[PDB]
């Protein structure tokens, strides 16, 4: 059965990205929606729509490709998993691809990027890497 919705959402993006799809639709949740919003703010995806319905909602994500159809998102990794959680100290918050990518940490301040969390001297669960 479904065990890691966050991982599953990342995989939908990875798979859709791999075949240069324009858009994908992810079943929504509060945490998945926050991750999607970071990707837009950080310029990894084009746009994100939240469609309501009777069920839990759908996130339509529009992927972003440069000139020459180049994929902006090169890779996505799930770090914290249901089987092995990963929490980081404020000073041990990882940089991703030597600062060319981002890491998404869930903190008590909110769901931030690595840079944002570092400025607040906050740690927390390291959700994913994106580069």
């Amino acid at each position: 059965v479904m065990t890691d919705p966050i991982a599953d959402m990342l995989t939908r993006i990875r798979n859709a990205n791999m075949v240069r799809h324009e858009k994908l639709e992810i079943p929504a949740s509060k945490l998945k929606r926050e991750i999607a919003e970071i990707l837009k703010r950080e310029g990894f995806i084009r746009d994100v729509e939240f469609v309501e319905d009777s069920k839990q909602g759908i996130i339509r994500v529009f992927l972003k490709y440069g000139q020459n159809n180049e994929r902006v998102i090169t890779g996505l990794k799930r770090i914290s998993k249901p089987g092995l959680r990963v929490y980081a100290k404020s000073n041990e918050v990882p940089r991703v691809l030597n600062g060319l990518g981002i890491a998404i940490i869930s903190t008590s301040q909110g769901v931030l990027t690595d840079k944002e969390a570092r400025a607040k001297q906050a740690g927390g669960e390291v959700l994913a890497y994106v580069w």
């Binding site: 950080e42 440069g66 180049e70 691809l97 030597n98 600062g99």
Partner: protein, 163 residues
């Protein structure tokens, strides 16, 4: 890439005597593997067969000159860590500090030194077959993203990227 404009050094990585069996005996040939590079961010490899070693090496150089790639280089090192993977060849390439020098295995070193990378850590994590180690190294080097172009793709300034 036009190799004429570039000043290309050539380095002989290996020469394996290979054999095709036929009636009566064995037809030996020599398979030279050569890397060439300008030492200023361009490097390529080629493979040439021939019955005599000099001719094998000549044919490798022409092949290598056809397949030059451009290796992104931040200062004297690579922009970020990468694991070059090709078949069982699996090379890890890490950026290093100034004055570290090139710390790499034999065939990997040829590629990096001819590419003109001065400071880099590497470690072969898979097969040490020269041809495949080189292919893995160049596959990995071909995946290096320069900070400037990433900013353009993501629609941000380099200041926002580095942070």
């Amino acid at each position: 890439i036009d190799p004429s404009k570039l000043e290309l050094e050539e380095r002989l990585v290996t020469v394996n005597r290979v054999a095709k069996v036929v009636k009566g005996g064995r037809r030996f040939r020599f398979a030279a593997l050569v890397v060439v590079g300008d030492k200023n961010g361009h490097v390529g490899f080629g493979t040439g067969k021939a019955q005599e070693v000099p001719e094998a090496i000549r044919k490798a150089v022409e092949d290598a000159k056809k397949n030059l790639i451009e290796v992104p280089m931040v200062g004297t090192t690579i922009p970020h860590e990468i694991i070059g993977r090709f078949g069982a060849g699996n090379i890890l390439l890490k950026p290093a500090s100034e004055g570290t020098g090139v710390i790499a295995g034999g065939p990997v070193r040829a590629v990096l030194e001819l590419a003109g990378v001065a400071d880099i850590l590497s470690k072969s994590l898979g097969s040490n077959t020269p041809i495949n180690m080189i292919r893995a190294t160049l596959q990995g080097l071909s995946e290096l993203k320069r900070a400037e172009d990433v900013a353009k793709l993501r629609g941000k300034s380099v200041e926002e990227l580095l942070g």
